[PDB]
Amino acid sequence: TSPVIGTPWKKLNAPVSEEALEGVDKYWRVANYLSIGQIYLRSNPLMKEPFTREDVKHRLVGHWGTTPGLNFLIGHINRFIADHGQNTVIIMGPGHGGPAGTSQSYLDGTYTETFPKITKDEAGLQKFFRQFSYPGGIPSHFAPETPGSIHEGGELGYALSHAYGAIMDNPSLFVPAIVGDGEAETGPLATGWQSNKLVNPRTDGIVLPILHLNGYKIANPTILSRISDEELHEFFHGMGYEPYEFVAGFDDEDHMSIHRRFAELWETIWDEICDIKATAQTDNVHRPFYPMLIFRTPKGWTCPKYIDGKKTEGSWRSHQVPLASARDTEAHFEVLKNWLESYKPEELFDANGAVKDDVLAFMPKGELRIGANPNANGGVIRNDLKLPNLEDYEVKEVAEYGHGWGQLEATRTLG
Amino acid sequence: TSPVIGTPWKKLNAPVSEEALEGVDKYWRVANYLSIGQIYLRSNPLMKEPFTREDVKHRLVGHWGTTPGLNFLIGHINRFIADHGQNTVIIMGPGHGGPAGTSQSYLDGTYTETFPKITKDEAGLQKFFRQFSYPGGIPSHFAPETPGSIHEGGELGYALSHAYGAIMDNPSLFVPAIVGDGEAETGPLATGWQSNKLVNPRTDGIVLPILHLNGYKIANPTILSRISDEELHEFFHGMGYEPYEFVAGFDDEDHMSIHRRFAELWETIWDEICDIKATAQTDNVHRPFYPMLIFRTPKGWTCPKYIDGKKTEGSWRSHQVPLASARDTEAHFEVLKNWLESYKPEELFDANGAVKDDVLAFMPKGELRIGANPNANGGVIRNDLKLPNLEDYEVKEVAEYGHGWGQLEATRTLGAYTRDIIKNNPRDFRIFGPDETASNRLQASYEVTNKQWDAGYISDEVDEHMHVSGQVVEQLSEHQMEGFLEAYLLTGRHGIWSSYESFVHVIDSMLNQHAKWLEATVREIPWRKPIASMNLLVSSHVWRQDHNGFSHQDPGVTSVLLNKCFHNDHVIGIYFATDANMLLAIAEKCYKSTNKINAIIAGKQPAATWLTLDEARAELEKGAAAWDWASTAKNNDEAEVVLAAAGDVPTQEIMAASDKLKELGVKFKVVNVADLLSLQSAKENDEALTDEEFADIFTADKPVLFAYHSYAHDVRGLIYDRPNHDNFNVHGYEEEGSTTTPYDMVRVNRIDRYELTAEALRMIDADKYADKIDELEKFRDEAFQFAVDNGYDHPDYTDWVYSGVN
Numbered sequence A: 001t002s003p004v005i006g007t008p009w010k011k012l013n014a015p016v017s018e019e020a021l022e023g024v025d026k027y028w029r030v031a032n033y034l035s036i037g038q039i040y041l042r043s044n045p046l047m048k049e050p051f052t053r054e055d056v057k058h059r060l061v062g063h064w065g066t067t068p069g070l071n072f073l074i075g076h077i078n079r080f081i082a083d084h085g086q087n088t089v090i091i092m093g094p095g096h097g098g099p100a101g102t103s104q105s106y107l108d109g110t111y112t113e114t115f116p117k118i119t120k121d122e123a124g125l126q127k128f129f130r131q132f133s134y135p136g137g138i139p140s141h142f143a144p145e146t147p148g149s150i151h152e153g154g155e156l157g158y159a160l161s162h163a164y165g166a167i168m169d170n171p172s173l174f175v176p177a178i179v180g181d182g183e184a185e186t187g188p189l190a191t192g193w194q195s196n197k198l199v200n201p202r203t204d205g206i207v208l209p210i211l212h213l214n215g216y217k218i219a220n221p222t223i224l225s226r227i228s229d230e231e232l233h234e235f236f237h238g239m240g241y242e243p244y245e246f247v248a249g250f251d252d253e254d255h256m257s258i259h260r261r262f263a264e265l266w267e268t269i270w271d272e273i274c275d276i277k278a279t280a281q282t283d284n285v286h287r288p289f290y291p292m293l294i295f296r297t298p299k300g301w302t303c304p305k306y307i308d309g310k311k312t313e314g315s316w317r318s319h320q321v322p323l324a325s326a327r328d329t330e331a332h333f334e335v336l337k338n339w340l341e342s343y344k345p346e347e348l349f350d351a352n353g354a355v356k357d358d359v360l361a362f363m364p365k366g367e368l369r370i371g372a373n374p375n376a377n378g379g380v381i382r383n384d385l386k387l388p389n390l391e392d393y394e395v396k397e398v399a400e401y402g403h404g405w406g407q408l409e410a411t412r413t414l415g
Numbered sequence B: 001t002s003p004v005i006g007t008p009w010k011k012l013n014a015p016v017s018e019e020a021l022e023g024v025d026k027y028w029r030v031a032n033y034l035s036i037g038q039i040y041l042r043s044n045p046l047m048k049e050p051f052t053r054e055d056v057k058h059r060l061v062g063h064w065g066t067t068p069g070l071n072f073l074i075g076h077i078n079r080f081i082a083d084h085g086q087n088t089v090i091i092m093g094p095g096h097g098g099p100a101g102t103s104q105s106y107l108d109g110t111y112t113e114t115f116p117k118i119t120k121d122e123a124g125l126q127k128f129f130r131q132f133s134y135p136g137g138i139p140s141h142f143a144p145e146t147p148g149s150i151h152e153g154g155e156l157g158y159a160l161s162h163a164y165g166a167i168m169d170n171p172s173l174f175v176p177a178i179v180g181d182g183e184a185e186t187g188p189l190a191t192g193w194q195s196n197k198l199v200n201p202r203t204d205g206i207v208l209p210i211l212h213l214n215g216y217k218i219a220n221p222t223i224l225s226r227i228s229d230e231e232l233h234e235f236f237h238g239m240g241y242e243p244y245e246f247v248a249g250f251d252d253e254d255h256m257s258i259h260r261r262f263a264e265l266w267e268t269i270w271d272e273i274c275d276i277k278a279t280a281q282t283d284n285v286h287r288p289f290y291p292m293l294i295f296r297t298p299k300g301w302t303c304p305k306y307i308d309g310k311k312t313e314g315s316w317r318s319h320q321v322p323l324a325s326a327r328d329t330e331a332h333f334e335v336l337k338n339w340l341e342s343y344k345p346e347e348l349f350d351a352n353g354a355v356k357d358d359v360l361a362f363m364p365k366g367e368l369r370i371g372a373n374p375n376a377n378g379g380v381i382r383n384d385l386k387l388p389n390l391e392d393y394e395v396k397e398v399a400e401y402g403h404g405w406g407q408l409e410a411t412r413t414l415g416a417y418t419r420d421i422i423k424n425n426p427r428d429f430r431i432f433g434p435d436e437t438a439s440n441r442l443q444a445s446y447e448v449t450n451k452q453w454d455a456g457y458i459s460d461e462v463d464e465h466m467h468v469s470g471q472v473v474e475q476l477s478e479h480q481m482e483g484f485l486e487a488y489l490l491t492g493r494h495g496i497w498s499s500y501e502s503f504v505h506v507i508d509s510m511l512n513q514h515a516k517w518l519e520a521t522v523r524e525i526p527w528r529k530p531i532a533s534m535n536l537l538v539s540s541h542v543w544r545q546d547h548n549g550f551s552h553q554d555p556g557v558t559s560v561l562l563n564k565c566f567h568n569d570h571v572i573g574i575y576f577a578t579d580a581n582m583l584l585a586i587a588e589k590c591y592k593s594t595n596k597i598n599a600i601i602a603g604k605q606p607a608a609t610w611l612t613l614d615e616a617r618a619e620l621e622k623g624a625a626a627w628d629w630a631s632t633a634k635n636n637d638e639a640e641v642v643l644a645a646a647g648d649v650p651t652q653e654i655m656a657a658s659d660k661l662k663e664l665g666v667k668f669k670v671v672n673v674a675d676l677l678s679l680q681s682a683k684e685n686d687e688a689l690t691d692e693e694f695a696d697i698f699t700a701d702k703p704v705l706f707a708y709h710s711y712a713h714d715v716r717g718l719i720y721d722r723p724n725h726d727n728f729n730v731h732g733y734e735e736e737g738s739t740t741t742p743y744d745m746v747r748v749n750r751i752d753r754y755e756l757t758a759e760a761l762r763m764i765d766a767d768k769y770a771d772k773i774d775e776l777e778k779f780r781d782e783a784f785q786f787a788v789d790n791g792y793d794h795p796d797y798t799d800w801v802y803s804g805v806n
């Protein structure tokens, strides 16, 4: 059966520490940098003099638009995991946010553990950037090759069915399930919201659905981000959820206020989940309203606002790559260079190219890490079934009466 | 009257100190440890190496489920008492939470004071643990043996009646009344919530009801914990309470947050009570909503959550013992050991086994301690009543006109006597009745007091003799009346209630529980001082229930009370008031008595007066007496028959039969029995008639015809080894009757004067009196046929006066 991992369903009973929030902000910067490096760079990962157009990959593959939002969420979830010791698996619904998943596994240390050639220094960082979506490297999506994935999310709409399947008979497991707002338009996702009527908060775990409401899919706005906020809240409340909304990045709020605001809302949500779990130890006959998070952020958050006079941050234009060929024009290379420098990698990486200790000192350790949780490599949990003796169910009458006897319904035997 | 103790109704005007809360948390740990030690351990109380299965008691007796909740509440109440100096008595409704009460008394020091062998060290702690519910030790419940108990709470449902009785005329007394949520399902508890309409916040104290909503009774959930929180609050608000809810222990809140949360809520409740008391010094005409506490906690709180895969904390499975045999399995012993260690007794007890000073430094001291409050040992408060001079109420007309004069209602005489007791003993004497005080003719008390009523008033045309305070209380509930009075007595005051005879049976089980309290007190608890007696006027009895008829005819209170007369306890008095002068003599004896249940069976119908007061006092001292003024035999050898009677209607029929026997020339002797236990075996009862005194009265060998008020079986059972008992012929109630005339009631039960005359002649010589016997039997049918025809009894019946009347 499922292992009980960690100290599940524990409240914090303190504000989030300012130091942990500085951890989360550095995580977001370096994961964003490492996501961009994987998309754009074939050489010179830390932009040593000279950083020129030759360091840019000849063909740009991958998706920026969902990625900085995923890096934000993943940073805060890692802080949450280390502070609470919660058994946690993430479902990355926008699975084309591959660079966030690989960046996470690189930062939590499970990537170098699993893939010993990709070291935590400047030559390993070069190999890390070149290999992404490249001939003989690793895939564009959150593929089974990535530590921490149980869901590639290439084909969209199964995030919630997979989230709820994961928590069945898994009462210590917390699953933050990130749902694309375009992905929420699909058939399979739309019915997946009702799965909370099929789970039990005592005998099963907890899914927190996170609607990645960035406003855009590939080339269109999203239905759920263009309907009214009252309709959107009524919708989730109608499906048995208690919705919480977070809005960020559409003004000039400094990034540290955003993190504090988010950590406060996260801990309020988590206190609601711990209450549900504590109540279910006594009353699991009455279905709670589960929390869900509406995460409303600009698509492509922290990319340059305008590229060639077209709105890129907060648009569908940031979906694949905001900047379309940084290898072909001096102007576009300079945009890429300034973008990479906006995260200030001189503060993130040390002289050897390792991510600095104070970037990652908030991270979880051990089996609680996203890429090391056994629920994300579930073959390690699985045992052979105790199977009953097959002759107890055999139709013996063939041997008595002859081949071709009877009018049995074969599936009753299997039953 | 009640002592003013402490500084009552004082607000704190500060937050509860963090040190006191650290005291309360250690109290709860050590009381929980000491509760478990009492249930499980026969040796090695502090689990010194080696602590093995041999230290476990062979048989586990007692109740865990209610206990940690009670220990929590008691810890916080002790903190409250020490901080405020409040005069406080606890009613422990779930009285099977015995270990909490004994643990409290051990921790407050009153246990070692009272029981000097149970010392405050490791050998005293060993004796403390072994003795609980053990052969030759102490009981499982919150018994009268425990300092601080006024209520055993074995039989459930009297917590609130006792709480409200305790605070009557006790304006400084605070009573936190802990009510089981299963106990709240009973009849007597359910009506007990309405008692706040019968108390006055100026002249009485304050009850805080605490609903111990742990969710479970023995094997079931509780109704009140499974209905909605809105229904549960509306319910208490409908009954005149302002409900406060506390919820704890169903999550992982640390224990120190729980204590702070609770102390904050306690002090808010207490500020509301102090406001009520301060308002009542000016306005006590408008009934406040009293606070009440809904205490919602898991049953068996802090026991292991799961034992053998079954939920134990927060279940009915923790009711008796969570762990069923820690002596039989290594696995179950380890569960007990880890449970005992979870309270961390190494921080609680020092090297010698005394509870450490910092555990108990928050506790109250002196008479404010729960086990030392005089209201919990109310015999120390109680004084003799100032009783008026009994000859002022004597019916003098017996001496003027003759034995058998008049048509007085005997209970009116008692009514005038009790009026002047109330007048001389203000705030010390109460009358209770289930809407029957006037009906049982005790309404002369309204000349000096009122019926206490604190619900709404509407009009002087209907609301006569009512006031927001007064010494008479009426509610149509025998459970309330008996329970109010019982606690008024246990807190040192005095009184009486009255009832119709057949409805005494409603509280048979309350009388049983009061008698077991008394029996245990007089046998073995000398530190518990004598309380005033439980006095019950039993009126409107079976013979004069020919207007309500057959299903109101049950004199069977006497059989119930005869089962509590053993081992010379003398906690029962059963008295037949022959007339008004005997009623006076009985009433004075009962009003002077202590530690008893006194049943006084008196008629309220017009009847003759047979005795003077000086004769009534002579018959009453022995219990039975010959009436030589009524006998025509002049000693025991010329009597042919003995005509005995117990009760006013049997006395009337026997005296009317003796006049018809006298007219026939028969030599007989007449006996009256006022005190029923005088007939009890002289071996069994050293107050009863000696066998020589019994045979002088009754005879050695003559036929005794005995007209008895109640079932003949009562008497036949009592005299089974008395001299001449095979010659008794007892006539009692025999389950016959209807709505009919008074003659027809005595006729169908074979106790009328004509049948009794006829039975005497059959006993003497059924053959020479054969003509006159057939004559008497024919008249019985004819006097019945007269009643049918005319609508009232035959004039030979109704107009009879005893020949002794001049």
Ligand SMILES: Cc1ncc(C[n+]2csc(CCOP(=O)(O)OP(=O)(O)O)c2C)c(N)n1
Pocket (backbone or CB within 6 Å): A065, A066, A094, A096, A154, A155, A156, A157, A179, A180, A181, A182, A183, A184, A186, A212, A214, A216, A217, A218, A222, A299, A319
């Ligand atoms: C079933 C299916 N149809 C079409 C696509 C192509 N596709 C990939 S990403 C994408 C937009 C996804 O939108 P959202 O769910 O809004 O993702 P995000 O913005 O976070 O990038 C689409 C249409 C898909 N992945 N799956």
Ligand SMILES: Cc1ncc(C[n+]2csc(CCOP(=O)(O)OP(=O)(O)O)c2C)c(N)n1
Pocket (backbone or CB within 6 Å): B065, B066, B094, B096, B154, B155, B156, B157, B179, B180, B181, B182, B183, B184, B186, B212, B214, B216, B217, B218, B222, B299, B319
């Ligand atoms: C009149 C009466 N009937 C039955 C019982 C048996 N009995 C003892 S404890 C108990 C359960 C009591 O429940 P609650 O009042 O709920 O007590 P607690 O949970 O606090 O233990 C019962 C039914 C009783 N004590 N009194």
Ligand SMILES: [Ca+2]
Pocket (backbone or CB within 6 Å): A180, A181, A182, A212, A213, A214, A215, A216, A217, A222
């Ligand atoms: Ca989107």
Ligand SMILES: [Ca+2]
Pocket (backbone or CB within 6 Å): B180, B181, B182, B212, B213, B214, B215, B216, B217, B222
């Ligand atoms: Ca209960």
